[PDB]
């Protein structure tokens, strides 16, 4: 039952300073070396640094890409694993992870977390209008029927969407964000059997963490 | 210091096939102490996080399925997998933990499967977006093979290129197709001007593109 957690990503401006947090449960956590490897959006994995274990004197290491700048920390009270990053940049715009590391013995990153996006950006947050996709004038005689969610003009990345809060996986498409006038914009479909809509509620969930926005919005026919 | 590089940048296999991937290292990681080769593989699948598939070049972690062989020593690493399946679509990573760590830039694996038809659906504004002065069109293609398709937008019957946005889904790690969502946008002024929105998807599938549209009279 390992859990890696991590938070503290969002928007920061050029030149700033954000702490992220990794929150971890399911080891004995001052065994374990911990690690934290970024990805900016559709690149490579980029090792950080580490932290090591109590029987290593949980000291530090850095990639060469960040030593000075960024700082890692551990609180083993809690199994708490921390990055201090200063004098933040655009390329430091990524998914930040972190992984359970050495513990003394095996060469492996056994686990990871979901990661936590950072942006740095001058841009402002913008919270998404979300809008119901509902078919117009044709019948689906096509057994099945399809609906969607628009999630338009927000910043930064990330947002959510589920479909009925998550009952309905199968079927989901959710399309990658594109960025247009410092705004995001995705969308996501669902396809589900006609006999089921709109006799019974499909509603997508949307959340956009940087706003706090939570969304349902229910797709009604007519 | 240890750079580290893997081949091919990536390549698409069909299900049941056999997938080979290679690792160099600028150095050995054989490390003499231990005898053992500090090279790790990760797979990470689209949307998720990287995951453990073998470490010390060679041994596969407990869970993962034995079609994962890690193989190699010194600077030269291989992971292959037998008998892909449609849920190894993932870019895999190797790394380097003989000093400190190194990622490699990672290999896409996608799955080559037989050509599919887009199902195709079209969706006019909302009401509530209208409410503010925009107009956004959606199209959904869905569920197709190969990723290449071409979407055209017309209104009244004209040609629209202008304001159009795609995106397209990465690979189902299902069925391996792919869907593309592609968006017009117009100022509410400029849809309740015209009154056929038009979507035509045209892909290797067939000759005949797949038209579908709406028309505002009828909404
Ligand atoms: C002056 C130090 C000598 O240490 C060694 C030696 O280098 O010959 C290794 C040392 O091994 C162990 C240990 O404490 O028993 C176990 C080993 O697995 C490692 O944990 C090492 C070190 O902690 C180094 O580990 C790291 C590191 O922290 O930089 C991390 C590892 O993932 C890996 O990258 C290694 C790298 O392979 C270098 O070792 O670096 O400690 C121990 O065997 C002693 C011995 O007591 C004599 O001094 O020798
Ligand atoms: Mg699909
Ligand atoms: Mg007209
Ligand atoms: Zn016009």
């Known amino acids: 039952e390992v859990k890696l957690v991590e938070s503290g990503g969002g928007l920061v401006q050029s030149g700033g300073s954000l702490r992220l947090s990794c929150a971890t449960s399911?080891?004995?956590?001052?065994?374990?070396?911990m690690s934290w490897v970024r990805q900016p959006p559709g690149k490579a994995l980029e090792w950080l640094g580490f932290?090591?274990?109590?029987?290593?004197?949980?000291?530090?290491e850095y990639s060469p890409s960040v030593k000075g700048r960024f700082t890692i920390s551990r609180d083993n009270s809690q199994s708490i694993l921390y990055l201090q990053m200063n004098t933040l940049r655009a390329e430091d715009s990524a998914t930040y992870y972190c992984?359970?590391?050495?513990?003394?013995?095996?060469?492996?990153?056994?686990?990871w977390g979901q990661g936590t996006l950072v942006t740095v950006s001058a841009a402002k947050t913008t919270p998404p209008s979300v809008y119901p996709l509902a078919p117009g004038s044709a019948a689906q005689t096509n057994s099945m029927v399809t609906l969607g969610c628009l999630v338009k003009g927000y910043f930064p990345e990330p947002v959510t969407v589920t479909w009925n809060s998550g009952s309905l996986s199968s079927g989901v498409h959710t399309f990658p964000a594109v960025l247009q006038s410092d705004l995001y914009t995705l969308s996501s479909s669902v396809t589900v059997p006609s006999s089921t809509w709109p006799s019974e509620t499909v509603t997508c969930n949307v959340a956009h963490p940087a706003s706090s926005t939570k969304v349902d919005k229910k797709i009604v026919p007519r | 210091d240890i750079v580290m590089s893997q081949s091919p940048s990536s390549l698409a296999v069909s299900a049941g096939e056999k997938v080979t991937m290679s690792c160099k290292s600028s150095?050995?990681?054989?490390?003499?102490?231990?005898?053992?080769?500090?090279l790790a593989w990760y797979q990470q699948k689209p949307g998720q996080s990287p995951k453990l598939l073998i470490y010390?070049?060679?041994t596969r972690e407990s869970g993962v399925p034995d079609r994962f062989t890690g193989s190699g020593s010194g600077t030269d690493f291989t992971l292959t997998i037998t008998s892909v399946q449609a849920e190894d679509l993932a870019v895999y990573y190797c790394?380097?933990?003989?000093?400190?760590?190194?990622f490699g830039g990672g290999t896409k694996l996608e799955i080559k499967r037989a050509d599919a038809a887009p199902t195709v659906s079209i969706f006019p504004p909302s009401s509530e977006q209208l409410t503010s002065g925009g107009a956004s069109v959606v199209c959904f293609l869905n569920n197709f093979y190969p990723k290449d398709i071409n979407v055209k937008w017309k209104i009244d019957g004209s040609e629209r290129q202008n304001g159009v946005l795609n995106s397209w889904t990465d690979q189902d790690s299902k069925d391996s197709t792919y869907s593309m969502s592609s968006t017009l946008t117009l100022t509410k002024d400029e849809y309740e001007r015209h009154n056929s929105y038009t979507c035509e998807a045209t892909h290797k599938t067939s000759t005949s593109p797949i038209v579908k549209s709406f028309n505002r009279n009828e909404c």
């Open positions: 992984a359970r590391d050495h513990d003394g013995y095996y060469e492996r990153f056994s686990y």
């Open positions: 399911g080891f004995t956590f001052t065994d374990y070396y």
């Open positions: 932290i090591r274990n109590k029987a290593n004197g949980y000291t530090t």
């Open positions: 150095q050995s990681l054989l490390n003499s102490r231990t005898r053992k080769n500090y």
């Open positions: 010390w070049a060679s």
């Open positions: 790394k380097q933990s003989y000093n400190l760590r190194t």
